[PDB]
Structure 1
Amino acid sequence: LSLFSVNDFTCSQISPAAIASNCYSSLILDYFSYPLSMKSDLSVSSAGP
């Protein structure tokens, strides 16, 4: 979070404090090139193209 300014921070079905407090079996980080303007198009569930 310090390295990259976070334009939007959203966590679904989980709490950020909880993930830090409890060890998780695996961590997945996905790298994608996405425009800042289309916030609505990208979501866990959305009709955006």
Structure 2
Amino acid sequence: NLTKLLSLFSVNDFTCSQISPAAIASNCYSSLILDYFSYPLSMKSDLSV
């Protein structure tokens, strides 16, 4: 339950590549990797694919 996890936080931006945020909640996968770290909203333009 990922919409569970994202209900704890206040979410400011959600962009995906080769998928959508809608799609990434729904689908099943053989492997999911979650990377997390501290990061300022001021530097959003630098956190881009």
- TM-score with structure 2 setting the length: 0.69
Q: For 1:5-43, what per-residue CA distance to the aligned partner results, in whole angstroms no more than 9, with x for missing partners? A: 111111110123333443100111101111111111111
Larger proportion of helix: 2
Structure possessing the higher relative contact order (Cα contacts under 8 Å, 6 or more residues apart): 2
- TM-score with structure 1 setting the length: 0.69
Q: How many residues align?
A: 44
Give the aligned CA root-mean-square deviation in angstroms.
1.4
Residues 29 and 40 of structure 1, relative CA distance in 2, 3 Å threshold: same
The structure with more radius of gyration: 1
Residues 9 and 20 of structure 1, relative CA distance in 2, 3 Å threshold: closer
Runs of 4+ residues over 6 Å off in structure 1: none
Q: How much identity, in percent, do the aligned residues show?
A: 100
Runs of 5+ unmatched residues, structure 1: 45-49
